[PDB]
Design a protein around this ligand. Structure first.
Ligand SMILES: CSc1cnc(SCc2n[nH]c3cccc(OCc4ccccc4)c23)nc1O
Length: 130
């Protein structure tokens, strides 16, 4: 849809602080901070697929809006995820151990803007079309 495409990371703010707030250890934060991922978003009927690709790590999720699914995150958390579309924004919540984090993906001008929140920490990652 508005989101379908191949997106390349072009800026990031506060991603280390966000990872730290999630309890990610140094080695994984180091590799994650240095990563320059592509994000490939596709849709087929009810099912949306989001691939995140980088030199040192690839991940993928596929989901139906509103239907909770199990996910293993890049930092190896075992979470329950739900994604919904609200006002043109894909809103993802991950829940694990009584905690939650939100990841909001929006389209703004030429950008795919991703806002990641854990407690008081807010990270913004910006992608542009490949
Ligand atoms: C949600 S938004 C988002 C998510 N992940 C990435 S790159 C992940 C990655 N690529 N290579 C990597 C190599 C090592 C570690 C990585 O991640 C760690 C991480 C990701 C997320 C939460 C906590 C820890 C990576 N870009 C984004 O924009």
């Amino acid at each position: 849809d508005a989101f379908v495409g191949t997106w390349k990371l072009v800026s990031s703010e506060n991603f280390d602080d966000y990872m730290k707030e999630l309890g990610v250890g140094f080695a994984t934060r180091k590799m994650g901070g240095m990563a320059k991922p592509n994000c490939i978003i596709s849709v087929n009927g009810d099912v949306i697929t989001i691939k995140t690709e980088s030199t040192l790590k690839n991940t993928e999720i596929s989901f139906i809006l509103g239907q909770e699914f199990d996910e293993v995150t890049a930092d190896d958390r075992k979470v329950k995820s739900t994604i919904t579309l609200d006002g043109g924004v894909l809103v993802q919540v991950q829940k694990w151990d009584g905690k939650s984090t939100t990841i909001k993906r929006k389209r703004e001008d030429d950008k795919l803007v991703v806002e990641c929140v854990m407690k008081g920490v807010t990270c913004t990652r910006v992608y542009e079309r490949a």
